[PDB]
Chain A
Amino acid sequence: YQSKL
């Protein structure tokens, strides 16, 4: 999955 800034 993508991690959020």
Chain B
Amino acid sequence: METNYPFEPNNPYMYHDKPMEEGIAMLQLANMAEAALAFEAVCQKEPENVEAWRRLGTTQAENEKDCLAIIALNHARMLDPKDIAVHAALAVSHTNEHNVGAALQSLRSWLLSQPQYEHLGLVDLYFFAAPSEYRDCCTLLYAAVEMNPNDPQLHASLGVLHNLSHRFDEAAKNFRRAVELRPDDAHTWNKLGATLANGNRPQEALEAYNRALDINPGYVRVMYNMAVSYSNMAQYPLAAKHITRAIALQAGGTNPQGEGSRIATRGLWDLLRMTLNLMDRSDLVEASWQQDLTPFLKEFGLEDMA
């Protein structure tokens, strides 16, 4: 139930002149690990900086660390409860962490914080695998779509909603509509991919994921999802290679020492270990326990760079 962000102690950005600009340059260079350290430094130096907390939060999600993402976005939300990108990110990370109620609440705050849509809050307004707020969210989002059908973000929010109710074929249509309206959005491509995989269409998901990687080559979360798709297809050696790549890039050689990274990296190593067991390669399992990348870089021909 942690509310304090566990800052990485190994952070050279704490003595950089311009960490915020560095972080944004690192995002532009597709380096999530470095961008997160830079935003962390900003959050330590300027704790009321809404943008630094928000960017730390979205960057950690992209770096496959939802737990840190949520803590960072929760700070951003405290400082500015109208920050709509904060609500959008929280709805996503909550959905991933199966916090269905928090995801519903974030979707509502996302819509109702928008001047375009806030009037919908004044409107006077089971057979679904969701709680009852889920029908309300449906009405609100469909009312918004009726007055503004070509807002891609309305479609993306329905996609999130339909994930929460395990309606993955519907979600996929939502995210398809969102990428049609905004095709350069790496996040939306990833969401379509995850939705297809969750709906047992890993071959289609891999297509979406390759689109997202084309846009953001450092999108560690997409690389994790690629491993998941291969794994669900029982293509264990390919999954093991992809997760190794995810791991390598998640660290980016920033060499983290903090408790935060300790727990957030473990789920990637867990997936590697399960893949190793399904490959009948128990001889590699102990290295997976010690989180030692070296034998995997060697094993999967990734010695050059991830």
Contact = CB atoms under 8 A, between A and B. Distances in A.
A1 B231 CA distance: 8
Main secondary structure of the interface of B (DSSP, over half): helix
Contacts of A5: 92, 95-96, 159-160, 163, 190-191, 194-195
A2 to B, nearest CB: 6
B269 to A, nearest CB: 14
Main secondary structure of the interface of A (DSSP, over half): loop
A4 B224 contact: yes
Contacts of A4: 64, 66, 96, 194, 221, 224-225
A1 B194 CA distance: 11
A3 B205 contact: yes
Contacts of B92: 5
| B205, B225, B229 pick with most chain A CB within 10 angstroms | B225
Contacts of A1: 228, 231-232, 271
Contacts of B163: 5
A4 B64 CA distance: 9
A2 B227 CA distance: 11
Contacts of B66: 4
A4 B271 CA distance: 14
Interface in B166-214: 190-191, 193-195, 197-198, 205
Interface string B214-246: 000000010011001101100000000000000
A4 to B, nearest CB: 5
A4 B98 CA distance: 11
Contacts of B195: 3, 5
B58 to A, nearest CB: 13
Contacts of B232: 1
B208 to A, nearest CB: 10
Interface string B80-119: 0000000000001001100000000000000000000000
A5 B209 CA distance: 11
Given A3-B205, A4-B66, 18 more contacts: A1-B228, A1-B231, A1-B232, A1-B271, A2-B96, A2-B228, A3-B193, A3-B194, A3-B197, A3-B225, A3-B228, A4-B221, A4-B224, A4-B225, A5-B92, A5-B159, A5-B160, A5-B163
Interface of B: 64, 66, 92, 95-96, 159-160, 163, 190-191, 193-195, 197-198, 205, 221, 224-225, 228-229, 231-232, 271
23 contacts: A1-B231, A1-B232, A1-B271, A2-B96, A3-B193, A3-B194, A3-B195, A3-B198, A3-B205, A3-B228, A3-B229, A4-B66, A4-B96, A4-B221, A4-B224, A5-B92, A5-B96, A5-B160, A5-B163, A5-B190, A5-B191, A5-B194, A5-B195
